[PDB]
Every structure is written in C-alpha cells, then in structure tokens.
Design a protein around this ligand. Sequence first.
Ligand code: HEM
Ligand SMILES: COc1cccc(OC)c1O
Length: 401
Amino acid sequence: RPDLAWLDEVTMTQLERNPYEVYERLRAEAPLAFVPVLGSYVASTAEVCREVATSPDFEAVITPAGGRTFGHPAIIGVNGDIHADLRSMVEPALQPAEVDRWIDDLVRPIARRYLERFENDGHAELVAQYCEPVSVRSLGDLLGLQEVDSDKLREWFAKLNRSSTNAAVDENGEFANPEGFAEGDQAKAEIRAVVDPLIDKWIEHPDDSAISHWLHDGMPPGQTRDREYIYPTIYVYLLGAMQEPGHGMASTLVGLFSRPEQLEEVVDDPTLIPRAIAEGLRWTSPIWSATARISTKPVTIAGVDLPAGTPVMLSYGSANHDTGKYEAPSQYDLHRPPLPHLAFGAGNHACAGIYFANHVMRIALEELFEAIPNLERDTREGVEFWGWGFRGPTSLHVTWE
Ligand code: HEM
Ligand SMILES: COc1cccc(OC)c1O
C-alpha cells in the first residue's frame, strides 16, 4: 500500500514504548492496515475491531508469537467443538452468580494481607507491592496454586508476556528475535515442574480448585481431560488472567492521579470505583493488541479486499482511543458517559472472566483507598507505560502522610 510506506519504518521498540502515535495515524489513514514489523494486518478503529471480532466470516487465530509460546489448544486460538469444550471448562467458576458467592472473602483478605506490609511506610511502589500481588494471589488461590509464591506467579506472566508479544519479523517474514521465545519456554518448563504434581494429585483426589474442575467437570466417571489438552489454557491464565487485573488497577490509579479532583471524588465516594475502573480500562487497555481473528472466506473490510485465511490483529487498545467514539481519548475522565468499550474484546471469543476481573479490581481499590486515603503520586518519579501486546505501567511510586 503505497501511501503507507512510512509503516516500513515503524519499529517494534517504538510500538512497545508508545503505540498511540502510530495507531492514531492508522485510525485516520487505514483502519485495516498491514504493519510490516508485525507481519500482519491490524485493526485499529472501534468499528473494524468490533466487526472482525463478531463477524461470521472470521474465527479465532492465535498471534504468531502467541502460538509459538502457547501451542495448541490455547482457548484463544481454537474454534468449533474444541473451543466450545474449553469454554464450558473454564466458565463455571466465572459465572456471575458463582463469583458473587465468594469473591469478597477471596480478594478482601488478600488485599488486607498485602496492604498490611506497607500501609504505614508512607511510600510504596504499588505495582510490585500491591496491584500485581493481589491479582495473582486471588486467581492463584482460585486455580489451586495456593503454594505458588506470588513472586513466582508474577515472574511467569512477565516471561510469557514478553514471549507471546515477541512479534517482530524481518524482511522475509521470519521472527527477528527468536531468542526471545526462550524465556517463554523456560517459564513453561517451570510451570510443568510445579503444576504436574498438582494435576497428578487432582486426578485421584479432586477438590474445589478450578484446575481440578477443569480436569473432572463434564467427564465420564473415572475420566479426566488429558493434561496436554488443558495446559495451553493454563498458560493463557498464567499470562493474561494473572497479569491483567493488576494492570487494570494500576492504570486506573495512574489515570485518577492525572485528574486529582477525580481521585478525591473516588476516595470520598468508593461507589464510583467501578466507573473509575471502566474508564481506566478504556484509557490504557491492559490487553492492548494480543488477540486476532482469521478470515474464513474472502471478505471486504474498511475497503480492503481480504482473501480467505488472512489473520487480523485486534488492537483493542487503539480502538479504545477512537475519536469517532470518544472526545479527547488520551485524557482520563471519570465523568465520561458510560459508553461501550473493547477492553474485554467482543464476540464468541470475548473475555470469559469479565465479572470476576471487575470485582478483583474493585475490591483491591476499595481496600487501598480505605487504608491510605491521602494517597498521592510521587511526582519525583515518572510513570512509564510499556507494551504493545499487553500494556501497563512499569511502576507506580506513591507517598502519603
Ligand atoms: C482487567 C482484566 C482483564 C482484561 C482487560 C481482559 C481482557 C481480555 C481480552 C481483550 C480478551 C480477548 C477478547 C477477544 O479476543 O475478543 C480476553 C480473553 C480471555 N480472558 Fe480476559 N481479561 C481480563 C482478565 C481475565 C481474567 C482474570 C480471566 C480468568 C479468571 C480471564 C479469562 C479470559 C479468557 C478465558 C479469555 C479467552 C476467551 C476466548 O478466547 O474464548 N480474563 N480477555
Ligand atoms: C496472548 O495471551 C493471552 C491473550 C488474551 C487473554 C489471555 O489471558 C486471559 C492471554 O494469556
């Protein structure tokens, strides 16, 4: 596409540090565009993302670096009968009525546990000390990984993050940085060493943990799903399910700090926390561009005639700054009207844990503002956001009296 020759000069590093400038151009110039360094078409607007995600002429496909990292059958990358089975496998503990039965007793004590370590220090780095630990500990306990230290869970999602977003390709469409997959392989090897003994145990002695239910639910008597069949979805969980609620909380905090009167309102009136989180998810989408669909027949989208078999990456983080939908989208605004957003995706492969994730983020922020209501950002330290596939702040230094 000749007028997009400037896309040839876009680098992976640039997209990781800040993708919003490139994607603002894409939204205006080519809502569906082939990005050479990513080796793929990408959808940048809300209209195109939603259309691709819900179209009957498209089905799920894993991103190339996602597939190299997760293998088969990752719930995000399969369709038909296998997807239906994996959806019914993960859905019971995520059902709203079920979450409402125990989410409070799960997350609130965990939030208190981590707050107690620093709430009187007067200084903290909330990503490492609060947002990520609460996120991984809550889901870890739900999964049956109580004995896996929160530092380990955080290290796993960081390595799987970097591996699955190791997307750069060279002039011949080959992965430019194949060594970047090695730490994804190392994380998987460690996960196998830890989780395989637990699966051995759950096969014979099922309990209340989610993974035990993944092995047993809906199976003939005495039978379990093969572990190779469920491991890629375990990996999917140990990346995005572990990582995203922590990044959603932190981005919401960074956005509130950017609007000090709005932060005061939320501390004064914690019933506004769910609305603050929804704006946070739109403002810096935790899953920014990590999933994709592939066309199953010839289709025309945003004026581009796509052949069958064409992958399209869904850059929901860009769709969420669509100026056809939002005014001044790069500005966090609690009082934006409650409009649809794509931070949870859309269609048959839309996020399965929305209700759970929203409560995890809500409860964590509630307990934070109660313990430290004079929270202030440490304006001596800058907040840098990182990631093209998954995006969030690398740290969040705060102070208080
Ligand atoms: C703030 C937190 C979260 C955000 C923003 C988020 C966002 C997303 C997005 C954008 C997708 C891809 C949707 C698409 O391709 O159309 C996805 C998929 C998924 N998420 Fe969430 N997620 C979050 C937390 C969680 C949690 C905590 C869990 C599990 C407890 C979870 C389970 C899943 C599953 C199973 C899928 C795959 C759905 C499928 O392909 O059928 N997510 N998520
Ligand atoms: C590419 O990896 C992922 C994509 C979307 C969601 C995930 O976890 C829920 C995830 O681990």
